[PDB]
Design a protein around this nucleic acid. Structure first.
Length: 341
DNA sequence: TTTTGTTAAGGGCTGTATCACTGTGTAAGACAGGC
């Protein structure tokens, strides 16, 4: 794992905590810019290309049949296999939470210049309340595909919300949501094993299962060291969901996850306590019914990283993470690194 | 029969309206990078 500093072009201000990166056919893209999109890039979607440790953000265009989704911070994202990206929830530049779900796909790649399709999917049934900091992944069971959504935070319900605490947030009830994108429907499942709310956790999806790692629970103000396996079977039109607690769970919120090889993932970064950062790294190796979490060699962090109180980042896709920390003195607002695996 | 106003010309304290003067905030422009 080699750490490398990155320089940024004129529009560095766009990058903020809560941003996301999506990878299409090796090409990386950036979404969730700070502020509302400007004339320079009306979509809020950017080619995110790092050449010789220099990062350029170049505006990307939408197809004629696209939505223009608002920039979203801490939305739930996953990748769907004809490869597309699912974005659900998040905070908008006006601090509202969206209940909408957007789908990003490549509409046209002409002479290495990508046009995107952003389509909004209506959701009916048990729609999950607007959220941020929650997970969504795709499971495959019995030749059928289903979305699994869990966790996050939201504002108080319209009945109890008051202007003195107008921005107060609470964890959502820990109901797993099965989401059929084909029909646009959502079903909620209460499980006894998920008693507490959880947000900013990590989710790993393999076949018919999603594992839930770390995260932070507001009510207890704990980052629990639990690992949850959630299995989904889809026999015809009657889905079934079952959860199992598995000991050996890491305790981490806001960690970043990257795939280094099939059935092996690396977990880097995050927070172990409010004032402490998780400097260690984990390797997760997947079996068809087993999951293994092993400590790995901690990278050669610089002193700036070691002493930073906050860091934020995203997975670039090619086993490489894009990281960031703030700096004061004279000078830059943010300093960015790329950690390879 | 007892209190006040009043005239005119004119003489000091007092109150406020400027002086001159510059730093400084805001904004009207100019300008140059998007390797």
């Amino acid at each position: 794992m080699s750490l490398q500093m990155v320089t940024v072009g004129h529009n560095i201000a766009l990058i903020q905590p809560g941003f996301s990166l999506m990878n299409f056919d090796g090409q990386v893209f950036f979404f969730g810019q700070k502020g509302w999109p400007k004339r320079s890039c009306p979509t809020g979607v950017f080619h995110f290309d790092i050449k010789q440790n220099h990062l350029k953000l170049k505006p990307a265009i939408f197809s004629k049949d696209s939505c223009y989704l608002p920039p979203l911070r801490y939305p739930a994202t996953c990748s769907y296999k004809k490869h597309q990206y699912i974005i659900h929830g998040g905070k908008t530049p006006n601090n509202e939470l969206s209940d909408k779900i957007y789908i990003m796909s490549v509409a046209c790649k002409n002479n290495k210049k990508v046009t995107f399709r952003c389509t909004e999917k209506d959701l009916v049934g048990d729609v999950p309340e607007p959220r941020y900091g929650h997970s969504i992944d795709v499971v495959y069971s019995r030749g059928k595909s289903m979305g699994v959504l869990f966790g996050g935070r939201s504002y108080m319900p319209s009945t109890q919300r008051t202007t003195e605490k107008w921005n107060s947030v609470a964890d959502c009830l820990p109901h797993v949501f099965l989401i059929d994108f084909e029909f646009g429907c959502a079903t909620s499942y209460i499980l006894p094993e998920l008693q507490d709310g959880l947000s900013f956790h990590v989710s790993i999806a393999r076949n018919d299962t999603v594992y839930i790692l770390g995260g932070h629970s507001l009510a207890s103000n704990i980052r629990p060291a639990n690992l949850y396996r959630i299995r989904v079977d889809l026999p015809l039109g009657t889905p079934a969901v079952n959860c199992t607690v598995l000991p050996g769970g890491i305790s981490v919120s806001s960690a970043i996850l990257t795939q280094t090889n099939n059935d092996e993932f690396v977990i880097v970064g995050g927070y172990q306590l409010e004032n402490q950062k998780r400097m260690v790294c984990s390797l997760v190796s997947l079996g068809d019914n087993t999951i293994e979490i092993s400590e790995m060699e901690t990278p050669d962090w610089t002193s700036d990283i070691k002493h930073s109180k906050i860091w934020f980042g995203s997975n670039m896709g090619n086993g490489t993470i894009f990281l960031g920390i703030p700096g004061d003195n004279k000078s830059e607002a943010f300093y960015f690194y790329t950690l390879r695996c």
